[PDB]
Amino acid sequence: MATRTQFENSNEIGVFSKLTNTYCLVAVGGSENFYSAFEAELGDAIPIVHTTIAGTRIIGRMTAGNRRGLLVPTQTTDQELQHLRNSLPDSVKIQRVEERLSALGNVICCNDYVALVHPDIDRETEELISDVLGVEVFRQTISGNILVGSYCSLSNQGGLVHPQTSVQDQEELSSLLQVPLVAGTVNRGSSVVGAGMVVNDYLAVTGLDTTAPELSVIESIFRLQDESISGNLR
Amino acid sequence: IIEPSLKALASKYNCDKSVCRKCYARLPPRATNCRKRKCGHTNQLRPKKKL
Amino acid sequence: SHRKYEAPRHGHLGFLPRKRAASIRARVKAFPKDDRSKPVALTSFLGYKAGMTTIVRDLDRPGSKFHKREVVEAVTVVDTPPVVVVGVVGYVETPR
Amino acid sequence: HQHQNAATLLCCNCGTPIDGSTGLVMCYDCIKLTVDITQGIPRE
Amino acid sequence: MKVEIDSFSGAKIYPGRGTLFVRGDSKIFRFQNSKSASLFKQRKNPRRIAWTVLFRKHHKK
Amino acid sequence: AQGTKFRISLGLPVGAIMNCADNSGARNLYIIAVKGSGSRLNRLPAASLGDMVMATVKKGKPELRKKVMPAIVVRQAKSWRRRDGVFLYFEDNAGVIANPKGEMKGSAITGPVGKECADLWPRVASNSGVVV
Amino acid sequence: ELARIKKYASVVRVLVHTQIRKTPLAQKKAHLAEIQLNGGSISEKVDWAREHFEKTVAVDSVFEQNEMIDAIAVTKGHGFEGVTHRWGTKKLPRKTHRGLRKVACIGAWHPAHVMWSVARAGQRGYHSRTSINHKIYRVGKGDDEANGATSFDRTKKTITPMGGFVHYGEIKNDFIMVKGCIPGNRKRIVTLRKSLYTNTSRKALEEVSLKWIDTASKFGKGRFQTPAEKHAFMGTLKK
Amino acid sequence: SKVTAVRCKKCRTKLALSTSFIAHDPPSKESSEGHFIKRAANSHRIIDIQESQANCSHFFIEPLKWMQPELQGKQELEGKFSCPGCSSKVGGYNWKGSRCSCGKWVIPAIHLQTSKVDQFPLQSTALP
């Protein structure tokens, strides 16, 4: 549901992990407590992969992916590419992307159906995203920011956006993304909402300093909320 | 949780001592003189403060 | 008067004198501790240093950031022909 | 029908409803007494 | 171990060799020695420097 | 606040004027200190790619000027040695300003960001466009 | 005399010498030395050396891969060096009369003597040094043309670079390849010693498998590893 | 009003409902109970005065069904328990006291600390 945990002592989970519908990715330098958050709740449905991208531990911001495909940047080595093609299932396709804009997570905000990309991305990538992910690509900015992946968490049900966002432009994106959108803060007043948390259909994991009113806004738009063991025995 | 039969067993080694005023040494509670030589075997002893 | 701004000493005092060595073959001052359960083997070897070259290896050190990662590094190649025994010498222990 | 039912922000600290844009999304009655105050001075 | 080609002329760069340059317009330049590097700072054109691979492809040497 | 980082070549002493990569109104930053620096007689404490410096704004918005506030280096002109082998260097120096926790005040970063800064600081990699 | 050593004589050394003729040095005079033995039952130590008179002792019988050793030699020398580069002291400012690469204050008035701890110019280099904990990576045989080859490299080459080791020649012999610098320059007689203490920490117990060896030319900015691929890259030349 | 639930942070398990909550709302504010008194070793001697906090930072609930194997097995007078899925210290049980942070007393206490737990409404969403 709405579980909270943290990597080593940092609240942000979207930097250090990439959660999709059919798989999950985590960085290698984690404690036993951080790994046990995903293992206890995902179970054996989707494969959890320990990986690194380009010699880094920031794999949630370097990669871009959904149910059908994964996009990795150029500096990902052949040893790390061969490891991912084994642990992930045969349904997903992994493709290395030649970019000037290396960090694909900040650039691409995507789901099963509709993706928003950075406006200065080139045309040879727009052909590549739509054929790998199988997603319509729409060049658009969140009202004041070009980094659409960092400031806008998105799932299949809903999407949380940047707090300083006009209502007149949320109705533009909801017309475009075909999902309802709510603005808010995560991690006790951090405007970077896509890097603080992750989301798929059946799970959404955020930081430990996310307050209780903030957690209500998250699970509401994503619609992941829903007892005999509790009772009175005196 | 401490079962105060055992708390009285441990306080004899920790709390029920006496302290010399000059050299701050830990002394037995029935003593009259400090056993060290760097305080000159002084006899100004105080009980150790209880919690 | 005092030094007015403290600073550590330049140089090391356990390496005095800086005088020229007695021979180009430096002596071995000390050999490892004898363990008489093990079979007979030598304790050192003589060789001639040739040069340096560069190496690449997969670093295997868990909990590091460069775990399962390639690193380059500098190695030294010492030319090592086989060495032939021509005698033995036994030392007794005296109080001097 | 694009529906953006958002109530732009709620708050950070308390559960009180709608605040505005431009920052300070903290429900001003909170920040008057709760957060630090960041005065940090002697007053006598 | 990947062997990257030299961006100036044509040369091959075995690992642990030569410099790398990240220009402010987000483009990565590789150089095998200070010859092809210091000719890059002087704004020379490698289609007119004779010993390069890019020249010898242009005249089909 | 600063985790483990492998030593890279020090290119920015006290008195350096590096650029300002973010969009917080400031134009350049003047380095006056490096957090966690050493101690040696007559030695200027120096910064590196990814260190945290105390810095002031000499040019930009007048609200940001005349106060000392911490900052994080994101580019460097002195060439450094990565462990995998290569010597690389950017074209100019750059820094972004931050709170002493390490969170960033600006919204985005223009220009590339060095990779050893994106691993060390979680907020800078969130706002980075291009990572090397 | 061998019955004399078996009865008395707590420790036993063995006089060895290298074979200088299998070496590109110009010297013809071999280097004699001693090596202590660490076997058991000192009657058995001299029974080992009885069998090995005028017998060769290999390299791989002594050392093996991934072992921590010490390297003992005589340093590169530099002759008479000044007080700044010898001890690393501070240079005086520019405005000083009669010399700035010096040390200003030798001592105080009392005691009226120059102490032994001041910095003072003299010989630098050519000293005996011991450097511990150098990790062996490769012990290659002599009659083996896959010295530079590796399991991930698969090209047939020696570790002698193109044009040979600069100022040395040819490694057509056994060799020891160890991590990091050894005291003493090239052509220098170097003693490699077993480790005095058993090391555990994390770095002695690591096992290495190499990816690639650099056999490009050391004679300056070398851009090719083997001459079989210099000819394939450049093509047919005039000569 | 409507019934509510108290879900555990990092466990996401419903620890206690409403139809509970013996909230004891007023503190006394007088000098003997509303202030925190630290005496001395002897002679009823006050060394410290501490003012009580704003709101009672606990939830005093009835002993519930999931608490029963910790309360039957090794029954003692004081201790602590956890969420049944994360083993994190949520609240302690004590048959003595531990008034509130804000201070009264209670009864024999089953306190559920409001740090590292939070309170959500049991009904549908507010739909803001």
From Swiss-Prot, chain A:
GO terms for cellular component: cytoplasm; cytosol; nucleolus; nucleus; preribosome, large subunit precursor. Coiled coil: none annotated. SMART domains: eIF6. It comes from the Eukaryota. The modification Phosphoserine is found at S174, S175, S228. InterPro entries: eIF6. Phosphorylation at Ser-174 and Ser-175 promotes nuclear export. It holds the Pfam family eIF-6. It is found in: Cytoplasm; Nucleus, Nucleolus. One of its GO terms (molecular function) is ribosomal large subunit binding. Its main location: cytoplasm. Keywords: Cytoplasm, Initiation factor, Nucleus, Phosphoprotein, Protein biosynthesis, Ribosome biogenesis. The keyword Thylakoid does not apply. GO terms for biological process: assembly of large subunit precursor of preribosome; cytosolic ribosome assembly; maturation of 5.8S rRNA; maturation of 5.8S rRNA from tricistronic rRNA transcript (SSU-rRNA, 5.8S rRNA, LSU-rRNA); maturation of LSU-rRNA; maturation of LSU-rRNA from tricistronic rRNA transcript (SSU-rRNA, 5.8S rRNA, LSU-rRNA); ribosomal large subunit biogenesis; ribosomal subunit export from nucleus. PANTHER family: TRANSLATION INITIATION FACTOR 6. Belongs to the eIF-6 family. Present with 18600 molecules/cell in log phase SD medium. HAMAP family: eIF_6. Monomer. Associates with the 60S ribosomal subunit. NCBIfam families: eIF-6. This is Eukaryotic translation initiation factor 6. The gene is TIF6.
Curated annotation (Swiss-Prot), chain D:
It is found in: Cytoplasm; Nucleus, Nucleoplasm. Transmembrane segments: none annotated. Associates with the 60S ribosomal subunit. Belongs to the NMD3 family. Present with 11900 molecules/cell in log phase SD medium. Acts as an adapter for the XPO1/CRM1-mediated export of the 60S ribosomal subunit. Unlikely to play a significant role in nonsense-mediated mRNA decay (NMD). This is 60S ribosomal export protein NMD3. The chain holds residues 9 to 52 of 518 of the full protein.
From Swiss-Prot, chain E:
Belongs to the eukaryotic ribosomal protein eL24 family. Keywords: Cytoplasm, Phosphoprotein, Ribonucleoprotein, Ribosomal protein. Transmembrane segments: none annotated. The chain holds residues 1 to 61 of 155 of the full protein. One of its GO terms (cellular component) is cytosolic large ribosomal subunit. Component of the ribosome, a large ribonucleoprotein complex responsible for the synthesis of proteins in the cell. The small ribosomal subunit (SSU) binds messenger RNAs (mRNAs) and translates the encoded message by selecting cognate aminoacyl-transfer RNA (tRNA) molecules. The large subunit (LSU) contains the ribosomal catalytic site termed the peptidyl transferase center (PTC), which catalyzes the formation of peptide bonds, thereby polymerizing the amino acids delivered by tRNAs into a polypeptide chain. The modification Phosphoserine is found at S7. Component of the large ribosomal subunit (LSU). Mature yeast ribosomes consist of a small (40S) and a large (60S) subunit. The 40S small subunit contains 1 molecule of ribosomal RNA (18S rRNA) and 33 different proteins (encoded by 57 genes). The large 60S subunit contains 3 rRNA molecules (25S, 5.8S and 5S rRNA) and 46 different proteins (encoded by 81 genes). One of its GO terms (biological process) is translational initiation. It comes from Saccharomyces cerevisiae (strain ATCC 204508 / S288c) (Baker's yeast). This is Large ribosomal subunit protein eL24A. It is found in: Cytoplasm. Present with 247000 molecules/cell in log phase SD medium.
UniProtKB/Swiss-Prot annotation, chain H:
Induction: By nitrogen starvation. May be directly involved in signal transduction and/or cell cycle regulation. It is necessary for maintaining growth rate or spore germination. Could show both activity toward tyrosine-protein phosphate as well as with serine-protein phosphate. Present with 7570 molecules/cell in log phase SD medium. Belongs to the protein-tyrosine phosphatase family. Non-receptor class dual specificity subfamily. This is Tyrosine-protein phosphatase YVH1. It comes from Saccharomyces cerevisiae (strain ATCC 204508 / S288c). The gene is YVH1. The chain holds residues 225 to 352 of 364 of the full protein.
